[PDB]
Amino acid sequence: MSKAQAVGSNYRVSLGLPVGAVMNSADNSGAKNLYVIAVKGIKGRLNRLPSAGVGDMVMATVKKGKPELRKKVCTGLVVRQRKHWKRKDGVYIYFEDNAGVMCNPKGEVKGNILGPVAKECSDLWPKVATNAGTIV
Amino acid sequence: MKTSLCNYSEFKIYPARGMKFVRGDSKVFHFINTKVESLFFRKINPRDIRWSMVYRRIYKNTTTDVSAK
Amino acid sequence: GKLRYMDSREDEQIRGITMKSSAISLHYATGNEEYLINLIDSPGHVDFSSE
Amino acid sequence: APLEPTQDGSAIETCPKGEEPRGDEQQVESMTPKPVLQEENNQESFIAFAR
Amino acid sequence: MSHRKFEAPRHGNLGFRPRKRAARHQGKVKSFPKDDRTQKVHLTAFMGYKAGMTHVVRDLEKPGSKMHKKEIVEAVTIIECPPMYIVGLVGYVETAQGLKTYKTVWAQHLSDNFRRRLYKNWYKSKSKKAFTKYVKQYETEEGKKSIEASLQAIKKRCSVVRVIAHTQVHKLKLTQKKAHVLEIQVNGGSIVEKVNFAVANFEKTVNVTGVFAENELIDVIGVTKGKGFNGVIKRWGVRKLPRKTHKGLRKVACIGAWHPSRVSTTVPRAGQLGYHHRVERNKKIYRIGQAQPEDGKQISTGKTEFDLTEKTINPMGGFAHYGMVKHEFLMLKGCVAGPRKRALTLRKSITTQTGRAALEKITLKFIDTSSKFGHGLHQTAEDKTKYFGVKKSRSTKA
RNA sequence: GACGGUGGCCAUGGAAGUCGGUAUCCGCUAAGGAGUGUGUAACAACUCACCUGCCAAAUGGACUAGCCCUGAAAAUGGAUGA
RNA sequence: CUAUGACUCUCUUAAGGUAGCCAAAUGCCUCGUCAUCUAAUUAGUGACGCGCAUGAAUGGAUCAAUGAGAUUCCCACUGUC
RNA sequence: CGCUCAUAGCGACGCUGCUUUUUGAUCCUUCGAUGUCGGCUCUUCUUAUCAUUGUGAAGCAGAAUUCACAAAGUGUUGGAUUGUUCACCCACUAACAAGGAACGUGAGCUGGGUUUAGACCGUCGUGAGACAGGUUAGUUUUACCCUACUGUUGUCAAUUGUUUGCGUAAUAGUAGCAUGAUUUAGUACGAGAGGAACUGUCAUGCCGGAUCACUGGUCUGUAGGUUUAUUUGACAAAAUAGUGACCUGCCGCUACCAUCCGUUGGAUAAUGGCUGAACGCCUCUAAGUCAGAAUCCAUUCUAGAAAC
């Protein structure tokens, strides 16, 4: 799932961390944390984490949030990777700290996206682009 | 590309090389060096190195002008 | 145009149901009269019924 | 409204109030026109279709 | 036991399995295309010299993309491309065993290549008077008769011929004490035509402008960096000593099983790191430059915007160990075999190809100048720094 | 060429040789089962059984056992000893 | 027998597991059942407990303080990966 | 059985087999000792092909499956739980297929179990003690030899000139594999609901070869600064602190923690035909031959023969 990239996949993979990394929910829904289970499309090989997306969809969970949203897996969307990258451009976007949002399995983000969102992510997921006034 | 201030330095971006940073507030911060970044994260005008010429002036042996203060 | 629920399709034309319950306010102040048309889209049902 | 969609661009510089930039994309399909007059205040369901 | 995974590729390609120290410190050739086009002006192969890399912005031409034209930095390899002088011809002969060097036919033109194939003859490892002309250099006036005699022979004998070419590098700063000879199999046109062309060449000394285009897919051949006696953890893509509690430095762990009861050839093992040939294919090239010396020195990129304010392309200073440019150049799209005293024997691709972004003609914008601690962006940053002060920074380090 | 009593009787608006079922008889002819299938809502049409024209002398089934093949896949490369 | 077996009757080898406690370091069947803890738990912990084969100085039950003690869970300075 | 219909797909009752990846039967070899189990590591191998490609079927309209063949070229995952294979859920995925190789791999590992001494509990035993009963703690030694292998010198003394260039290429190895979005197209297909392909286009996963323009990483560059303690009477400049610590930090080496690069011809397989007999017809076949796989072999690529 979902899947819709992009055109392209907005080029190479970069992560803040793979499996077992907290990033904030950045969402009006009362998920307060997002912890990764795994990432979609990772086919992977012998001993290698299923590694965080640059703006791609993930199997996640609400570890600390609303108890209703707590437990039960959730497809999400990575929004900003603390750990850095170069783009086809020659810039190195880098962030304060990791972040994403909990989302629908057609990609759609629920409420409104908080804070700054890398443009690649927006490009990937049109709903994301729609539901924010910050796309930097 | 195009020339731009690094937002914590007089040393401007050579339209080519360096880094970028967004932060929680959502802001442009282009950078060139890691030292600059460090300085930003501390919040201080440069005071553990000679490389930035702010320091050679206030130490003397380069910029022999204002000398004593 | 095409607001207040109305999804146009070529599939339907080819042959397709895609039923829906909607209504557009389509009044006309043409000349000296009124014309209460209103785009009624009754979904109905494919088999014989009360529905 | 949240400020800075673009970075070093002419969106925040202009800061449109429905002038030259937003006039475009209102002829092929009106982007965000409020088609059915959406719910400003909370739900109190008394809806019906009927004749 | 099953395995039990799946993947275990032989960490590493088996395709380079001898992994020796490759002999020829120029990209050794053993491969060219074939043709009979009236255009026989193509020779197949040049040889330049790497003297570092820089980077460049160029708006790219590949519609269908997320953006059809958009600024992007690409890295870029630059190589001093001096003159290829051609001291002789070598014919050949078609046969069962392969081909053969019956014997060469050298004209005259230059004799600097000679005192490189030398200073090694007789007792005490070496001497400096010739004991041998016994596989070597002929005369001049009483040389051309031989050529005339044998030209006709090679005209008739349909086996292909290559030119005994060589670059000039004592004209660079490097002062190479090794002989830098290279074959270039002439292609296109008749055998006779080819030999005539070769003959004509002896009267002249070609450069790369005639061989390749500004937009032209090369297959670089070089010698990679020879990184030394080195370990399996580092020689292949093998995951290491599983633990800290483990008892090895330099290991695989299993090396082939009781299985066929001797070790297998193909098993990850430490030796010395690839100093091989290899052939990086389809380097598109962005520019041939004009030669620096005797004007062209202050001209590597022309006009302001799209070529920008004038400059030399080169990376500044004499370098603590390394080379600085002084001749015409090739802007190969990123990376080549080895470091910066290393011969990139070039050849046009075997299967020259249309595709898409193999041929797409291409334009540039800003271009770098290297090292950030000590210098900045060439002439502009030179000026600003100077203005700021001459006690602080100017940007010239010998 | 491959007809008639005839849409035989049943079931069945209808299923007429042939959804399906039963009895399955005779006339005329060299020749034609109340019919092998295809097909038809079903009839028909075609095809078969069945008969003749031409070509012109061999043909058809059913088994039997000799060699060959199928069956007949497993792990370092590979053994009629080569 | 609505029944966990209070209670009666009998038999051996006298008595016949009381209070407690438990799939415990004691439970084979056994990954017991229910519950929680987890994205997922043969792990832990609460409960249940006709307990293969628990149990009262063979000492039973609990528990502050302590422990290079055994188990788990969370925060814990992320080259174990 | 499967509306109909034995064999599309299954297939009762019954028979013939293979297999040595279960375990038993066995005791031929080893008790003057093959280091027992598992997991990490890693190659190679077999096919009984999970995906892939090319195909043939279907109860195959489409998507989606199901069955068959050629085919081992390439792929075949991250966890939770358990000593653990076996097992048992979650999670992605093209697929998460089976196996072998002294039940591959202890002078490669840890030792989690099992297998000693100490102990605990239960049960059994008059007791010493027993328990495929649990529980807890319990030294993984030696390669400097021979070979095999990795890389490297040396030799090529009949590789023939006291010797040295530039070449050839036999032989060996060989590499790229795969996905997604988009176009096609909401078109074909389909009552509908749903819903494709050949080609093109842009990217990704893994893998393989390089590199360091950029960025990130590091520091004996002890290159500069900041600071502690100490010592050199102070200032200063230095030392000791076995690199004093800290912040920067070059060259350098390096990170799908960055970048660039990985082709095209014939030969076939299955299979689909063509002409076409044996067998007046008829038939992809017997003679003969067309197309045609990730295949085969070359091309390209590594090494370069007591080979020229």
Q: Which of E241, E273, E305 is the last residue of a domain?
A: E273
| Burial of E187 per CB tally in 10 Å (0-12, 13-18, 19+) | buried
Rg (CA), chain C: 14
List beta partners, residue E367: E56
Kindly report the nearest CA distance between residue B35 and chain D, in angstroms: 24
**Chain position carrying tokens 């909990």:** A102
* Interatomic distance E266 CA / H173 C1' (Å): 10
CATH of domain B1-69: 2.30.170.20
Which of B16, B21, B26 comes nearest A134 by C-beta?
B26
Measuring CA to CA, which residue among E283, E385, E379 is closest to residue E336? E283
Residue nearest to nucleotide H165 (CA to C1'): E135
**Chain position carrying tokens 């062309």:** E197
Q: Which of E156, E177, E206 is the last residue of a domain?
A: E206
**Chain position carrying tokens 């897996």:** A73
Span between the terminal Cα atoms of chain A, in Å: 26
How far apart CA A107 and CA A37 sit, in angstroms, is 17
Residue E19 identity (one-letter amino acid): R
Residue C47 identity (one-letter amino acid): D
Residues E307 and E388 reside in one and the same domain: yes
Nearest nucleotide to E245 by CA–C1' distance? Answer: H110
Residues E264 and E341 reside in one and the same domain: no
- Which residues 146-175 of chain E have a CB under 7 Å from nucleic chain H? none
One-character DSSP codes across E103-131: --EE--S--SSGGGS-S--STTT--SS-S
Residues E329 and E216 reside in one and the same domain: yes
Is the distance from CB of B29 to CB of B20 less than 8 angstroms?
Answer: yes
How far apart CA D9 and CA D26 sit, in angstroms, is 23
How far apart CA A109 and CA B23 sit, in angstroms, is 22
User: Of how many residues is chain C composed?
Assistant: 51
Nearest nucleotide to A105 by CA–C1' distance? Answer: H92
Q: Which residues contact A128 (CB under 8 A, 6 or more apart)?
A: A55, A77, A79, A107, A109, A113, A117, A121, A122
Q: In units of Å, what resolution does this entry have?
A: 4.2
Measuring CA to CA, which residue among A122, A72, A115 is closest to residue A95? A115
Give the angle C15-C19-C25 at the CA atoms, nearest 5°: 115
Kindly report the nearest CA distance between residue D8 and chain A, in angstroms: 10
For E65, half-sphere exposure in the C-beta direction (CA atoms, 13 angstrom radius) is 16
Nearest nucleotide to E259 by CA–C1' distance? Answer: H101
Is the distance from CB of E188 to CB of E37 less than 8 angstroms?
Answer: yes
**Elucidation technique:** cryo-EM
Tell how strand C22-24 and strand C39-41 pair up. antiparallel
Taking CA atoms, A12 is separated from A54, B36, E50, E335, in Å, by 8, 27, 29, 19
Which of E7, E8, E66 comes nearest A10 by C-beta?
E66
DSSP code of residue E229: E
Residues in A closer than 8 angstroms to E72, CB to CB, are 88-90
Q: To which CATH superfamily is domain A1-136 assigned?
A: Ribosomal protein L14/L23 (2.40.150.20)
B7 contact D CB<8A: no
Assign E344 to helix, strand or coil: strand
- Give the nearest chain D residue to C2 (CA atoms): D29
SS3 content of chain A, % helix, strand, coil (to 5): 10, 25, 65
Residues E26 and E1 reside in one and the same domain: yes
How far apart CA E132 and CA E63 sit, in angstroms, is 62
Residues in D closer than 8 angstroms to C2, CB to CB, are 29
Assign E226 to helix, strand or coil: coil
For E192, half-sphere exposure in the C-beta direction (CA atoms, 13 angstrom radius) is 2
Kindly report the nearest CA distance between residue A45 and chain B, in angstroms: 32
SS3 content of chain B, % helix, strand, coil (to 5): 20, 10, 65
Residues in C closer than 8 angstroms to D36, CB to CB, are 3-5
Assign E384 to helix, strand or coil: helix
Residues E138 and E180 reside in one and the same domain: yes
At residue A77, φ and ψ (nearest 5 deg) are -150, 115
Annotated binding residue C31? no
D5 contact A CB<8A: yes
Measuring CA to CA, which residue among E296, E133, E279, E261 is closest to residue E217? E279
Residues E236 and E251 reside in one and the same domain: yes
Nearest nucleotide to E260 by CA–C1' distance? Answer: F76
Residues in D closer than 8 angstroms to A133, CB to CB, are 1-3, 5
Residue B69 identity (one-letter amino acid): K
Q: Is the CB of A129 under 7 A from strand G?
A: no
Measuring CA to CA, which residue among B25, C23, A131 is closest to residue B7? B25
Is the distance from CB of E46 to CB of E30 less than 8 angstroms?
Answer: no
Is the distance from CB of E75 to CB of E55 less than 8 angstroms?
Answer: yes
D6 contact A CB<8A: yes
Q: Is the CB of E261 under 7 A from strand F?
A: yes
Question: For chain B, which residues make up each domain, given as ranges?
Answer: 1-69
Buried b (16+ CB within 10 A) or exposed e, E318-341: eeeeebbbbbbbbbbbeebbbbee
Is the distance from CB of E372 to CB of E394 less than 8 angstroms?
Answer: no
Tell how strand E84-90 and strand E105-106 pair up. antiparallel
Is the distance from CB of B16 to CB of E55 less than 8 angstroms?
Answer: yes
Q: Is the CB of A72 under 7 A from strand H?
A: no
Kindly report the nearest CA distance between residue B59 and chain D, in angstroms: 37
Question: For chain A, which residues make up each domain, given as ranges?
Answer: 1-136
Range of the domain at E39: 1-43+225-273
Is the distance from CB of E191 to CB of E35 less than 8 angstroms?
Answer: no
D-contacting chains (≥3 CB pairs under 8 Å): A, B, C
Residues E279 and E396 reside in one and the same domain: yes
Span between the terminal Cα atoms of chain B, in Å: 42
How far apart CA E145 and CA E139 sit, in angstroms, is 10
How far apart CA E157 and CA E91 sit, in angstroms, is 9
Q: Which residues contact E217 (CB under 8 A, 6 or more apart)?
A: E281, E282, E283, E284, E285, E348, E349, E352, E353, E358, E359
Contact D3 A135 (CB under 8 A): no
How far apart CA B64 and CA C11 sit, in angstroms, is 83
* Interatomic distance A71 CA / G20 C1' (Å): 40
- Which residues 329-348 of chain E have a CB under 7 Å from nucleic chain H? 333-340
- Give the nearest chain D residue to A130 (CA atoms): D32
Which of C2, C4, C21 comes nearest D36 by C-beta?
C4
- Relative orientation angle of helices E144-156 and E191-202, to the nearest 10 degrees: 160
Q: What is the CATH number of the domain that holds E169?
A: 3.30.1430.10
* Interatomic distance D22 CA / H195 C1' (Å): 38
User: Of how many residues is chain D composed?
Assistant: 51
